[PDB]
Structures are given as C-alpha cells and as structure tokens.
C-alpha cells in the first residue's frame with residue numbers, strides 16, 4: 001500500500017510512479033532514463049500540462065540511499081502537483097508554464113539495500129576492482145573537480161568518488177538526461193538529508209558562481225519562506241563554506257553546464273534522528289520544503 005505519509009519501499013514507489021502517471025495523464029508522463037547497476041529502471045516523471053517550448057525545472061531525490069526523507073519529498077511534490085492543480089493559483093501557473101522533471105529515486109539499488117539489509121547504506125551497490133567493498137558515492141561521481149576534495153579514493157569509504165566521473169550507471173544516466181535537455185532545463189534541484197540547508201555552487205573548490213549574489217538572495221528568501229510554516233531554521237550558501245568542500249557533486253556539475261539555478265536541499269533534521277527521521281515528521285518536513293521549492297520555482301518563472 002503506498003502512502004505519502006510513510007516511507008515506501010522501492011516496489012511500492014515503482015508501482016506508484018506507474019499509477020500516478022496512469023491516473024494523471026494530462027499532467028504526468030513517465031520515462032526510464034536508464035538502468036541501475038542491478039538493472040532497475042530509473043524512472044523519471046515529467047510533471048506539467050503540455051504546451052509549446054516550455055522551460056523546465058529538474059528535481060531528483062534519493063541520491064543517497066539512507067536519506068529516506070528525500071525520496072518521500074519527491075513523492076510529496078508530485079502529490080501536491082496533482083492535488084492542487086486548478087485550485088491553487090501558483091502551482092497551477094507553474095505546471096501550465098513549466099515542466100517539472102521529478103526523479104523520485106536515483107540510487108534505487110542502494111535504496112532497496114537500506115530496506116533489505118542495511119538501513120544506513122549511502123552509496124550505489126556497484127562493484128569495485130580489487131576489493132570486496134561495494135559502491136560509489138553518486139554525489140562524488142560527477143565531472144566537477146572530480147575526486148579532488150571531500151571525496152575519497154578508497155572504494156571502501158562512504159565518499160568514494162568511483163573509478164572515473166560518471167562511472168556509475170545511475171550518474172551517467174542522469175548526466176546524459178540533463179545534457180540532452182540542457183536548452184530547456186533552467187534549474188536543477190537535488191534533495192538530500194540531513195542538516196537543514198539550501199546550498200548552491202561551489203562545493204568542489206572555494207570559488208563562487210558568477211551569479212553568486214542572485215543565488216545568495218534567492219536561497220535566503222527560500223529559507224525565510226520555509227520557516228514561515230513551522231519555524232524550521234535552515235542555513236544557506238555556497239556548499240564549500242556552508243556544509244563542507246566536496247567534489248564531484250551533481251549541483252556543481254549542473255551549474256557548470258550552464259544551469260544557473262542549481263541547489264542542494266538538505267532536509268530535516270539537525271541530527272536528533274538524522275537519517276532515521278521518523279515517519280511522523282514526513283508531512284511537516286515536506287510541507288515546509290514545498291514552500292521553498294515553490295519559492296525557487298516562482299523566482300525561476302519570473303526571471304526567464
């Protein structure tokens with residue numbers, strides 16, 4: 001049984017991607033952008049009413065297997081789109097004028113593993129030459145100062161950068177999709193947990209994006225909007241100085257392709273539950289996070 005207020009296993013999420021598409025054909029289509037190491041289809045939902053030459057926002061969840069609130073959020077975003085389209089002026093305007101690509105779970109193999117074997121798994125489940133240690137950090141696997149800081153060369157480490165940038169099937173598939181849709185994708189949003197932050201480039205070096213001032217102000221206003229609901233306190237800024245320097249992240253990579261609005265969201269909490277955020281917090285976390293995402297979306301829409 002699928003529920004938006006619980007964590008759902010991969011079989012349930014996959015079935016939900018079919019059913020939500022099936023039930024909302026005027027707003028949702030579903031493709032597979034490739035397959036995982038283990039051969040699972042990486043589903044992608046395109047959310048929006050058809051129209052000509054529509055710009056797009058790309059959002060993924062579930063890079064990191066254990067960050068279950070991420071996967072729940074992408075699902076929540078789709079829930080909102082389908083529930084409030086027609087009733088709420090903003091979301092209606094967004095879906096009429098933009099398309100949202102929502103990739104509910106990037107690292108499916110890892111996610112399955114968190115359900116069957118090890119709740120605290122992070123990485124992919126691919127093999128590494130010369131060791132039995134499994135997996136690559138997908139957010140250290142992009143071609144963005146690849147493997148240079150805040151990433152490990154050791155395949156047994158949690159931030160393992162992999163054998164080469166885009167060595168993972170999942171990261172290759174994501175990058176290929178973005179590269180193939182670059183002239184329409186105006187913003188890239190990647191959802192993680194935890195520590196309550198809105199981060200923007202760069203993380204791979206202590207350097208700042210050309211539109212730093214604009215990103216800073218947007219991130220600040222998004223954090224302010226998020227707090228209006230439950231008072232939840234986020235920090236924000238360039239990744240390297242706001243969370244830690246880390247190379248090979250998808251947001252930095254996306255920004256270096258020319259996607260000017262590129263953010264990583266690190267959802268609740270600040271460590272009390274960490275990755276094991278209880279189900280009772282799914283609704284409040286997603287709701288407040290909707291406010292930030294809708295704020296960013298509205299900004300993007302108003303500054304094309």
Ligand SMILES: Nc1ncc(C[C@H](C[SeH])C(=O)O)cc1Cl
Nearest residue numbers: 139192203239246247249252264
């Ligand atoms: N470019 C980036 N932008 C954000 C992050 C933070 C996440 C939080 Se889980 C991570 O460590 O991958 C990491 C990188 Cl490498």
Ligand SMILES: C[As](C)(=O)[O-]
Nearest residue numbers: 193194195243266
């Ligand atoms: C606090 As963390 C390991 O999710 O960046």
Ligand SMILES: [Zn+2]
Nearest residue numbers: 088089090091
């Ligand atoms: Zn209004």
Ligand SMILES: [Zn+2]
Nearest residue numbers: 064067192193
């Ligand atoms: Zn993460």
Ligand SMILES: [Zn+2]
Nearest residue numbers: 192193194266
């Ligand atoms: Zn995190």
Ligand SMILES: [Zn+2]
Nearest residue numbers: 201202203239
């Ligand atoms: Zn970054």
Ligand SMILES: [Zn+2]
Nearest residue numbers: 080286287290
């Ligand atoms: Zn709501």
Ligand SMILES: [Zn+2]
Nearest residue numbers: 299300302303
């Ligand atoms: Zn303005």
